[PDB]
Amino acid sequence: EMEKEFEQIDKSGSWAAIYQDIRHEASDFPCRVAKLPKNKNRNRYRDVSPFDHSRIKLHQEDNDYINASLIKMEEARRSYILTQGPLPNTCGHFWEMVWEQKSRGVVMLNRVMEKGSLKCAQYWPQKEEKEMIFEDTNLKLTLISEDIKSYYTVRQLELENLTTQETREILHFHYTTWPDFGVPESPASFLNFLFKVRESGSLSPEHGPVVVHCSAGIGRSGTFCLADTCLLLMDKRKDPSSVDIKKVLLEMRKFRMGLIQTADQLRFSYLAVIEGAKFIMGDS
Ligand SMILES: [Mg+2]
């Protein structure tokens, strides 16, 4: 059990220490495509790069680069695409990736402006009657409906491939209350948001992998995936205290660097898994 392990780290304020053990043990793989000079303006942060083995490739010949990694969790039968918040020049690339990977959902965990600065481009329409057209990738994007709630917004979007004239419906899940500094006081709203994504079908294997992002696509995005996968492994497994959060994290870091950026995000991640265990070990 890891409810027990939480007590001891918290009691002895050892979070920052646990957290460094993870940094040291974490994998390091080449990030060569990302560091090519022709890709410098496709990267929001120069220290956050996809490894070459797990990077998502666009099907354009000129340049196939987008800062995005596929995270494949074999036992849980979950895949995720973690990417950065799009830049003004990568909005068309982003929706091209969503198109090519047959994703059904986009999870966004940041606000467009945080701490007085822009953390993401406004990459979806805000009014039904003003659609967006991405000329470089030949895609049209329309807002269909928008359901605003206390701590999250869900939007139905229509994506049309202008070339082939086909269209798909994409769900945009936008967590809007992650605090500017720190992590939420309680996992309650976050877990409720996670179960809403689950309920929508967007994580299910008939679909492409879900696209998850924040500003760099490693911090809050990492917390989302780590919690989903852990809670899944605790349903699948004979022994629901045989799930080691730290091992799961280290296995996802084989696929994208830096996932979970602070010891506070680590603490919060234990916290949401522990609390989520209640609502899937029968206690509806
Ligand atoms: Mg209106």
Author numbering: 2 to 285
Task: Provide text from the study.
These mutations decrease kcat but do not change Km, consistent with allosteric effects from their locations distal from the active site. For Q78R, the difference features include some similar regions, such as the β sheet and P loop, but are more limited, perhaps because of the lower resolution. By contrast, Q78R decreases exchange for an adjacent buried β strand and the active-site P loop, which houses the strictly conserved catalytic cysteine (C215). These regions thus form a conduit from the mutation site to the catalytic center, consistent with significant functional effects for Q78R in vitro and in cells. Based on specialized electron density maps that reveal low-occupancy binding events and protein responses in atomic detail, we identified one of these fragments that allosterically shifts the conformation of the catalytic WPD loop from open to closed.
Protein tyrosine phosphatase 1B (PTP1B) is a negative regulator of leptin signaling in the hypothalamus, where it dephosphorylates the active site of leptin receptor–associated Janus kinase 2 and decreases signal transducer and activator of transcription 3 (STAT3) phosphorylation and transcription of the anorectic neuropeptide, pro-opiomelanocortin (POMC).
